[PDB]
């Protein structure tokens, strides 16, 4: 189904995003998070949660790449 494919893509993009951010590859990590946000029916709610979790300059960079 389309749903298992999408869940998988969403989760794998997040996991690569987190790993990249942990390595200090902020720009690359953010690019993958923007793919995860793009397939979500609630982008604003994902953005709120990322604002509460990410360092402010990475969140801000996120906002500019969306």
């Amino acid at each position: 189904k389309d749903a298992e494919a999408v869940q998988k893509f969403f989760l794998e993009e997040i996991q690569l995003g987190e790993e990249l951010l942990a390595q200090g590859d902020y720009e690359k990590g953010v690019d993958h998070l923007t793919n995860a946000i793009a397939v979500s029916g609630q982008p604003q709610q994902l953005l709120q949660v990322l604002q509460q979790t990410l360092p402010p300059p990475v969140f801000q960079m996120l906002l500019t790449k969306l």
Partner: peptide, 11 residues
């Protein structure tokens, strides 16, 4: 890792 996945799925 994997935490970011749960926070965002639950969002």
């Amino acid at each position: 890792g994997x935490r970011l996945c749960r926070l965002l799925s639950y969002a």
